[PDB]
């Protein structure tokens, strides 16, 4: 009966029915986004109202709509026509992915370009790439995708090995017109294949790996009730799923003795962007907001046992809407398991004679998505000791180009004539905090060095300082690894037994933030990515650091607009937005398929508990 | 027959015999350090000569000696009398640990101090703490330990719960005299116990953890030959053990097709220091060089199966010398196992229809040591994809003090009246590099931001720069996390198929370095700890960043002295010394026994291979 339960097939079909009945979902309509809304603050006391938010596209060229439906009551709560030139285009539709290649294949300019390079049009794949917002006035108010070409020599060939540089096209996917074809000149199309299952490239497969068997003869240490409520080693949470954000954690809390103590109300990856650093006009417009533009949840993989998730795995199979409002299940789309995590605590004491060792474990909740060439694993970890961690695992095939004769400051070489433009993958974690409840504040904590002198005669002392972030205008912060900078979220009205406010400390990896010039389009559209930490006052309509409609949407929405309100965040219901990313200068080792690389963050208890929370963990 | 084999019991007894025969090991002599020396450069062609280095202490007050013995030939190579006031005292002896408490227990000043606090001398434990070098002229040339007191209420009590603040004593452990007893005033001795196996504190133990079974029905994927030569998934290395450094890796190489390609010649943790940041005179002298002063290898734990090391474990049981030259085995002191490491690479391709997933694994080589209150796990990892990683895991019981009435800028509160002084744990990894052989160089690589303008009209471009470190004077470097700074070790004479020098990139965690004022004693004695990266030209006598004799030794030796030679490091036999540490402001959660926290670094291949090295990893 939890209001945080996953959407069921029935609820989605019911949203479909309500929209149909209301005249909002005729044959020209397509659902670009559909997701359940979280319960309002203080809604637990009142009866439940399951509400769904829907973005409806119209293939005949009519304006799209944003609609909220109450599936409980069978009503339309609100329906509003969107002016996309102002507020943004809807997310890219699944069905639009083929359209770019299809339209280009009969366009005389495109055909001329391919003929100049002696490429068979039947073998040319075209990626359906988000367009962003640049200097082309005609694109304002139109759904545009840009196309980059890759040659596929045969059906099972990896087209990424054969980029067609010097060529890009722009297409209106509603009116089904090619608006521009730009050919800056021929580059050699790299010839080596990148087929990582071809024995000629792999060589003989290793026979040297012996089996590793991970089993649980009595089953897992966690329970699942109500479909998605997890209880494990004092932790309690609900595992949600949204087609945009993917796996979302709700109501993260820890049972400390008799009391269920909230820590985080909602945790999600609310945006992720992949900005490219190649100034060639063929790619200088390239910034993929995988979450906001493409919707990472919708492309979640079905995860196979013993391959993707190893051990005793409990799967969730989230349901999403197709383009017509019919439910579609992502079978085994979410993995849940616990795993051993080495030593938790250990001491062999000379004076007492007592030797003590305890093992750690973590609960893992994950999914894996595929966005064109990229594949990303999103992992949330809960540890016995109260630590919470996120990790992103980046793999797939690197996005390629030609490698210029004479080299490049912005592209690395992977194979003869084959380049990989420099880029970043930058995530925003939205952490709606609830440290012992909703009354929270954030402090920035720096190490403080001290000068040798009076009070510090041996020059050994060091200290720290904490600065409370009192209003949103003061709450846009940068990393300082040299001074060990962290951010503590505390509850000023909840004290531990030592009379100190309870808290959690966020530990960042301090990787570089967005590198683009601050005057670029991407610096405005991904403003969140320019700073490591933002704190806002909670509001129900402030969901994404980039706003609701990212596709072809200029600056104007998202975090810079939210913080302008300059709201009180000193002992209030607040939200932390942490930017973290990977800066990728591709290496030869990344080709032809990339080994996983990782980035993330964690939060550790900081005077939250009255002593170690794992004293009751048993031996062996 | 490997010259890198572990020392055997027989070799140690033979060193004993040779020293005895030579008149160097009479009844007043004690071995403070004994270890095998590595083979000289180019020694493989010539017959083997197993040589051992020995530091010999004399309990009658005579000068100690440094001796090198050839156990193969039964000879003394060299023997030299040490002037400890100049070059340093020998490492702390096991047998000296009891002496501080024993001497203090009959000293009238110490007894007066205990009586003022109503403490039973029979219940007062005294830690045998390294003294360092401060303002006490009488200590120069004498073996001094300083004592801090902790009350143990009964034999199985954790004395760390009951620090006796305001009191410190200094003792000459050779002449067996108490030189000073300093009592700055009484502080309350904290009363709560810290007994983490007492049910009253733990409460009822959890019954909610179900078993996790990790097995290998056909055994491990690695082989061990010659006692300590490991071969695993293309990697080759020898696992050494030294009483000072602990586990040392030799000859790390990777079999790429037909060629065994060297990467790292020797990897070790060559020093570790724990500087304290409390300006109280009771502790302001406190800096524990666990490696250099105490010898971490000698206190390696015997690791129990299913508790310390889980899965299919292969143990090494290294042999060390006791104080008289008799061999002593550390049973199951080194764990070796492989473990699953999640997804290695994954792509689901739209155009080819091919779905591909491969799993990662790592080889783990570890030990755990105990130094008083502290316990540290040292972990080396080798991954399928060519990555090499070190991780230190810090646990044990935090070093305590009183918590001052009215608080402290340099001490945190753990329990009523109980404090934990701020401190750091700072490691130095010595990496004798051999990237495709010995001709190596180091470049510092920074991300480079670019300005919007001509050549970068959209303001999206970003790049990087590499600066070769050509001589040792230019090779003392600091972190810059904001610019994504890393260091690449390459071989300028070995190119990959793309005509680029092969290399490995060192990725640091960019944690704060030594915080002490640069004019302090500790900044001079642990100079290495003030900077993140040092590069030297290889020399056989440049083993430790702090020199051979750290105990009570001023500045004068170690890294600052090595780099003054200003040797060529541009395409030469070089050594990288990476400083990395944890800055610890203890939390209530660290009490009464600390959950593990970690720090480390890794090196990843950077154009070392001609493409991904894991294309031949099989499915499932
Ligand atoms: Cu990348
Ligand atoms: Cu510590
Ligand atoms: Na909140
Ligand atoms: Na070297």
Q: Which residues of A touch B519 (CB under 8 A)?
A: 452, 459
A516:B620 CB<8 A: no
Dig out the tokens for B252 from the structure. Answer: 């790390």
Mutate to test the interface with B, among A370, A588, A600 (most CBs of B within 10 A): A588
**Element of type H or E holding A103:** helix A99-104
Measured between CB atoms, does B24 come within 8 Å of chain A? no
B214:A214 CB<8 A: yes
- The Cα angle at residue B237 between residues B234 and B242, in degrees rounded to 5: 160
Note the Cα A310 to chain centre separation in Å.
Answer: 23
Q: Which ligand is nearest to the CA of B599?
A: 2
Q: How far is the CA of A266 from the centre of ligand 3 (A)?
A: 8
Q: How far is the CA of A475 from the centre of ligand 3 (A)?
A: 15
Dig out the tokens for B553 from the structure. Answer: 């030794």
A612:B591 CB<8 A: yes
CA distances from B194 to A25, A374, B375, B395, B408 (A): 66, 51, 17, 15, 22
Q: How far is the CA of A439 from the centre of ligand 3 (A)?
A: 8
Give catalytic residue positions of B: 290, 374
Residues B387 and B602: their CA atoms lie apart, in Å, by 7
- Please tell me what DSSP assigns to residue A71: T
Q: Please, are residues B313 and B390 in contact by the beta-carbon 8 Å criterion? A: no
Q: Which residues contact B399 (CB under 8 A, 6 or more apart)?
A: B160, B276, B373, B374, B420, B421, B423
DSSP string, B347-403: EE-TTT--EEEEEEEEEEEEEEEEETTEEEEEEEEEETTS-EEEEEEEEE----EEP
A592:B609 CB<8 A: no
Rg (CA), chain A: 26
**B406 Ramachandran zone, left/alpha/beta (phi>0; psi -120 to 50):** left
Note the Cα A110 to chain centre separation in Å.
Answer: 35
Helix, strand, coil share of chain A (percent; to 5): 15, 45, 45
As to burial, measured by CB atoms within 10 angstroms (0-12 exposed, 13-18 middle, 19+ buried), residue A564 is: exposed
For A606, nearest residue in chain B (alpha carbons): B587
Dig out the tokens for A346 from the structure. Answer: 């250990």
As to burial, measured by CB atoms within 10 angstroms (0-12 exposed, 13-18 middle, 19+ buried), residue A403 is: buried
From the list B310, B516, B604, which residue is nearest A340 (CB)?
Answer: B310
**Interface A:B, Cβ pairs < 8 A:** 441
Cis, bond preceding B592 (omega within 30 deg of 0): yes
Residues B282 and B276: their CA atoms lie apart, in Å, by 11
Cis, bond preceding A592 (omega within 30 deg of 0): yes
Q: Which residues of A touch B464 (CB under 8 A)?
A: 422, 585
Instruction: Choose among A55, A45, A52: nearest CA to A73.
Output: A52
Question: Which residues are near ligand 3, the ion (C-beta closer than 5 Å)?
Answer: A 432-433, 538, 573-574
Q: Which residues of A touch B500 (CB under 8 A)?
A: 413, 588
Q: Which residues of B touch A254 (CB under 8 A)?
A: none
Measured between CB atoms, does A541 come within 8 Å of chain B? no
Residues in chain A: 620
Q: Which residues of B touch A462 (CB under 8 A)?
A: 277, 410, 422, 515-516
From the list B588, B593, B606, which residue is nearest A498 (CB)?
Answer: B588
Measured between CB atoms, does A134 come within 8 Å of chain B? yes
Measured between CB atoms, does A515 come within 8 Å of chain B? yes
CA distances from A138 to A135, A202, A415, A486, A599 (A): 9, 48, 39, 46, 39
Residue whose structure tokens are 């009519």: A62
Q: Please, are residues B362 and B591 in contact by the beta-carbon 8 Å criterion? A: no
Measured between CB atoms, does B592 come within 8 Å of chain A? yes
Q: How far is the CA of A375 from the centre of ligand 1 (A)?
A: 10
Measured between CB atoms, does A137 come within 8 Å of chain B? no
Give the residue numbers of the binding site of A for Cu cation.
423, 425, 584
For B287, nearest residue in chain A (alpha carbons): A460
Instruction: Choose among B67, B57, B66, B81: nearest CA to B143.
Output: B57
CA distances from B483 to A1, A413, B450, B479, B486 (A): 50, 22, 13, 9, 9
- Give the bridge partners for A180, in sequence order: A170
Return the SS3 of A227. coil
Measured between CB atoms, does B193 come within 8 Å of chain A? no
- The Cα angle at residue B439 between residues B437 and B441, in degrees rounded to 5: 120
B352:A158 CB<8 A: yes
Q: Which residues of A touch B590 (CB under 8 A)?
A: 612
Main-chain dihedrals φ then ψ at residue A95, nearest 5 degrees: -70, -15
For A445, nearest residue in chain B (alpha carbons): B585
Cα atoms in the Cβ-side hemisphere of radius 13 Å centred on B587? 25
Q: Which residues of B touch A206 (CB under 8 A)?
A: 233, 616-618
From the list B279, B585, B620, which residue is nearest A461 (CB)?
Answer: B279
Q: How far is the CA of A555 from the centre of ligand 2 (A)?
A: 46
Task: For residue B360, count other CB atoms closer than 10 A to its CB.
Answer: 20
Residues in chain B: 620
Q: Which of residues 552 through 571 in chain A touch B, CB cutoff 8 A? A: none
For A350, nearest residue in chain B (alpha carbons): B372
Task: State the SS3 of B291-320.
Answer: HHHHCHHHHECCCCECCCECCCCEEECCEE
Q: How many helical (H) and strand (E) elements, i.e. helices and strands, does chain B have?
A: 7, 34
Main-chain dihedrals φ then ψ at residue B454, nearest 5 degrees: -50, 130
Q: What is the resolution of this structure in A?
A: 1.7
Q: How far is the CA of B588 from the centre of ligand 2 (A)?
A: 13
Q: Which of residues 142 through 181 in chain B touch A, CB cutoff 8 A? A: 150, 152, 155-159
Residues B53 and B48: their CA atoms lie apart, in Å, by 16
- The Cα angle at residue B480 between residues B475 and B481, in degrees rounded to 5: 140
Instruction: Choose among B191, B588, B187, B593: nearest CA to B402.
Output: B187
Dig out the tokens for B197 from the structure. Answer: 């196996």
Note the Cα B172 to chain centre separation in Å.
Answer: 28
Q: Which ligand is nearest to the CA of A263?
A: 3
A589:B385 CB<8 A: yes
Instruction: Choose among A28, A245, A285: nearest CA to A145.
Output: A285
- Tell me the nearest-neighbour CA distance from B75 into chain A, angstroms: 38
Domains and CATH numbers, chain B: 1-87 (3.10.450.40), 94-195 (3.10.450.40), 196-619 (2.70.98.20)
Dig out the tokens for B286 from the structure. Answer: 């406190």
Q: Which residues of B touch A284 (CB under 8 A)?
A: 457-458, 460-461
Q: Which ligand is nearest to the CA of A272?
A: 1
A612:B592 CB<8 A: yes
Residues A480 and A488: their CA atoms lie apart, in Å, by 15
Q: How far is the CA of A573 from the centre of ligand 3 (A)?
A: 4
Approach to solving: X-ray
């Amino acid at each position: 009966a939890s209001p945080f339960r996953l959407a069921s097939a029935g609820e989605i079909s019911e949203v479909q029915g309500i929209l149909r009945t209301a005249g909002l979902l005729g044959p020209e309509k397509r659902i670009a986004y559909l997701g359940v809304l979280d319960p309002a603050r203080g809604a637990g006391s009142e009866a439940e109202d399951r509400r769904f938010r829907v973005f409806i596209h119209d293939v005949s060229g009519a304006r799209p709509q944003e609609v909220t439906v109450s599936v409980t009551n069978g009503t339309v709560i609100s329906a509003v026509e969107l002016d996309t030139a102002a507020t943004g285009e809807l997310p890219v539709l699944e069905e639009e992915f083929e359209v770019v290649e299809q339209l280009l294949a009969t366009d005389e300019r495109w055909l001329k370009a391919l003929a100049a390079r002696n490429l068979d049009v039947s073998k040319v794949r075209v990626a359906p790439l988000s367009a962003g917002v640049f200097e082309y006035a005609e694109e304002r108010g139109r759904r545009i995708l840009r196309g980059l070409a890759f040659v596929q020599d045969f059906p099972e060939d990896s087209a990424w090995a054969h980029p067609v540089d010097g060529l890009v096209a722009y297409v209106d996917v509603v009116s089904k017109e090619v608006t521009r074809v730009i050919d800056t000149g021929v580059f050699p199309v790299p010839a080596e294949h990148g087929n990582y299952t071809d024995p000629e490239l792999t060589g003989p497969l290793r026979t040297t790996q012996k089996p590793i068997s991970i089993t649980q003869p009595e089953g897992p240490s966690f329970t699942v009730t109500g479909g998605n409520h997890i209880e494990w080693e004092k932790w309690s949470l609900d595992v949600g799923f949204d087609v945009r954000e993917g796996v979302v954690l709700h109501n993260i809390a820890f049972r400390d003795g008799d009391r269920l103590r909230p820590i985080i109300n909602r945790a999600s990856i609310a945006e992720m962007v992949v900005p490219y650093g190649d100034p060639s006009p063929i790619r200088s417009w390239q910034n993929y907001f995988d979450t906001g533009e493409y919707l990472v949840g919708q492309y979640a993989n079905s995860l196979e046992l013993g391959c993707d998730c190893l051990g005793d795995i409990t799967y969730l199979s989230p349901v999403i809407s197709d383009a017509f409002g019919n439910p579609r299940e992502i079978r085994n789309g979410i993995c849940m398991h616990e795993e051993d995590w080495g030593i938790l605590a250990k001491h062999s004491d000379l004076w007492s004679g007592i030797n003590y060792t305890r093992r750690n474990r973590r609960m893992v909740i994950s999914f894996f998505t595929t966005i064109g060439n990229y594949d990303y694993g999103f992992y949330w970890y809960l540890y016995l000791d109260g630590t919470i961690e996120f990790e992103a695992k980046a793999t797939g095939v690197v996005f390629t180009s030609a490698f210029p004769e004479g080299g490049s400051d912005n592209i690395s070489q992977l194979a003869p004539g084959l380049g990989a433009p420099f880029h970043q993958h930058i995530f925003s974690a939205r952490l709606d905090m609830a440290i012992d409840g909703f009354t929270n504040r954030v402090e920035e904590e720096d190490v403080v060095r001290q000068t040798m002198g009076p009070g510090n005669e041996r020059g050994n002392a060091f200290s720290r300082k904490r600065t409370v972030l009192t209003r949103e205008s003061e709450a846009v912060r940068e990393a300082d690894a040299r001074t060990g900078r962290t951010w503590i979220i505390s509850n000023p009205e909840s004290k531990n037994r030592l009379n100190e406010p309870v808290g959690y400390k966020l530990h960042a990896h301090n990787q570089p933030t967005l590198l683009a010039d601050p005057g670029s389009s991407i610096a405005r559209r991904a403003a969140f990515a320019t700073k490591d930490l933002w704190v806002t006052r909670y509001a129900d309509d402030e969901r994404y650091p980039t706003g609701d409609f990212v596709n072809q949407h200029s600056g104007g929405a998202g975090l810079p607009s939210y913080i302008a309100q300059d709201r009180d965040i000193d002992g209030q219901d607040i939200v932390v937005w942490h930017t973290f990313g990977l800066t990728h200068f591709p290496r030869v080792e990344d080709w032809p398929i990339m080994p996983v690389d990782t980035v993330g963050f964690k939060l550790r208890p900081e005077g939250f508990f009255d002593r170690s929370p794992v004293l009751d963990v048993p031996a062996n």
